[model samples]
Target: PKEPEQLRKLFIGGLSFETTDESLRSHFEQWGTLTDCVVMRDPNTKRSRGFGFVTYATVEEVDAAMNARPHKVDGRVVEPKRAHLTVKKIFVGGIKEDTEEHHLRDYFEQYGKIEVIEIMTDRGSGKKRGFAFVTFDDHDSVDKIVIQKYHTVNGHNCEVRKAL
Candidate 1:
């Protein structure tokens, strides 16, 4: 059987070369009691892999961290996603312009409680990239959306496939 999930661990990407394990820990410790922090490195080059992880001891803190995305860590913005969240995420498009994170999250909870919502945005202007990724704690939540022939948001509608 597969290993049990660790609710507090996260996969962080887009790190700056200047970030150190100590700096990463300090940034996330405010969220909760962190149990582990790993910055992957090149075995030979001994350089940062440009990504790392921060594991908390509580689920609530993890949720807070994920909700507060595009974190400015070490002078560079980073993406912090649940460590095991890859398979459970879905891609969405045609999001009404100016839709905030909370508004984007409003659409997913009825199916099942959503754990994380990430909307990519432009690096310069800070405008949304016009798309997003939503992850559900329960698989049934994903199923419910997939069964629907279509969905609409704020009077804006478009065809979205199962590609994230």
Candidate 2:
């Protein structure tokens, strides 16, 4: 049996602009229990940033999923090496309107130490747009947090993706 720590996390890239968190989740869930699924989007235009992350429950699941299907988006096939595992910070979005930077930090702190929590706000309203950026101290913690709590934040469905 493989240790939990040995499980690999896959980084998906070359996503189409139309892809959503739900779509990504649905596609990857076919291989195994998906820990997290996300499609990066531009901060300003709310358009896809052309990449995302899909974490499997175990390394075997990751391997199976990677080998089971060809990674393609908009007819473009993405190479397997492009989805190799690595440690890096990820960004969470679709935060609730009532949430703040401190609240987000507090929520994510349960998984690991947060390096930073940035809550974007409108210049005039000063209200949250239901989105935020969270930086974890380590990649493992980021993966764990995403797996455990990516889609369910304060009863709100959220999305998490690798931060560029």
Q: For residues 95-158, could you state the per-residue lDDT of candidate 1 as single tens digits?
A: 7566667765666666567888888788999887788778878543564465456867555563
What is candidate 2's CA lDDT for residue 164?
A: 63
Q: Which predicted model would earn the best TM-score? A: 1
Evaluated against the true structure, the overall lDDT of model 2 is 0.67
For candidate 2, the 10 contiguous residues with the lowest summed lDDT are 78-87
Work out the TM-score per prediction. 0.53, 0.44
Clashing pairs in 2: 95-130
- Give me the candidate number with maximum lDDT: 1
How far residue 128's Cα lies from its native spot in candidate 2, in Å, is: 1.6
* Global local distance difference test of model 1: 0.71
